[PDB]
Amino acid sequence: PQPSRPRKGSLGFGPRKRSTSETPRFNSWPSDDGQPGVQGFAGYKAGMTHVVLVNDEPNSPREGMEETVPVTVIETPPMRAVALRAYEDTPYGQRPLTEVWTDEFHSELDRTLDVPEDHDPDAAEEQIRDAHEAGDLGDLRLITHTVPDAVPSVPKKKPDVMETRVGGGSVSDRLDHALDIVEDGGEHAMNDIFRAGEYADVAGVTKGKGTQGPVKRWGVQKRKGKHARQGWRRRIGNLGPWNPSRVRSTVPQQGQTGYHQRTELNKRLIDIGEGDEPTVDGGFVNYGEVDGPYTLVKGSVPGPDKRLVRFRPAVRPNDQPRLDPEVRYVSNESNQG
């Protein structure tokens, strides 16, 4: 009577098309609780190595013992928060109200957008504060951009720009926090947002794999035994029943597999630092050498090396934070081998 069986692949990550922006775009932010503060950061993927850590789970039998942990090295130099865009609540959700810019811009931001030559930071700030008075102010977010020039392993110089929400205490104190950050020049660091041992959601555009069939793309079986020899090795049984006379979009079919955006929940930040302590002998394969601001994320991170990844305070953590894990060892052994 044909045994039951879950369907092949999830219907929640589609359509499985190529990503629109190689740069990730979070679709949710953390809750407003602590003092004000930017709710995200970004860097470029370099590669992996492992680390030896002192278990610190109060409920683990191994608490206090050496434990090897896989880690992804993310180069995270300082970014620039160039503007303060405010949103207003309208009958059709939120809409961009206005933006507040700075004067000092990175020497090469002119590779992506048209840097402002004549702007009015007060006329805007005024419009924003008037809005806040009327009570029509939706969240406040900072237009943010990276400085890939600080990263030699990345060929590009043209910055990657992304909006990052600002969350915190009261909207008023928050708006003032935002405005100060921008006014400066915008510059801020991973330190400013994250502390080692906290959980962060990492978003990124996965590695691209061009077109692939149902087996690899959806995880369908390969024909078995005699069926694998008569002319069909990796083609699903049928596109559907006689009726409905049409192919449903749910039947696993070939197509774009990879280069999709994925937001990976609760990634433990093992350590934030700067320098070349986590580099690998011979250099990270297909990347280069690390020697600057970096982050060690526990586990894997979507995308190939050199791809821009985004950090965000975990929105649905399952564990309480155990700050500053004790890193007893960081492998520097060549990855070639």
Binding site: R5, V52, P61, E67, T68
Partner: protein, 132 residues
């Protein structure tokens, strides 16, 4: 069951023939079932270092042969991973027959035993000659 303390890649399946690392009179055991396991369509129910399995005696004294008994996997060829990353594997695949209360049925155990098995069936481990 209590956590093993190592990650295991099941090296056995329903139907696998393995050594009976004890002196119950059973020389070879055939895996029939894995206590507490539920697989998925078309998948052969698998077993590995640490599991409690139901077994039938294939080789041994006439008195033991054909009997369906419970056992514990004590050694396996496919590697297992320990907290510190090191992998560990054995020369053969073995299981010790055990009773209703999980106490070894035989008097002596033959060959080494993974320390991990001690975190479940202590009475089995406390009959081991060598614990690796």
């Amino acid at each position: 069951m209590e956590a093993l303390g190592a990650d295991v890649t099941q090296g056995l399946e329903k139907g696998s023939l393995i050594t009976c690392a004890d002196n119950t009179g059973a020389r070879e055991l055939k895996v029939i079932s894995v206590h507490g396991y539920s697989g998925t369509k078309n998948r052969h129910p698998k077993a590995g270092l640490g599991d409690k399995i139901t077994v039938s005696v294939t080789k041994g004294t006439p008195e033991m042969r054909r009997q369906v008994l419970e056992a514990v996997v004590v050694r396996q060829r496919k590697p297992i991973r320990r907290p510190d990353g090191t992998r560990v594997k054995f020369e053969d695949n073995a299981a010790v027959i055990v009773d209703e209360n999980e106490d070894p049925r035989g008097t002596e155990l033959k060959g080494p035993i993974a320390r991990e098995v001690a975190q479940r069936f202590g009475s089995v481990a406390s009959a081991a000659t060598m614990i690796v």
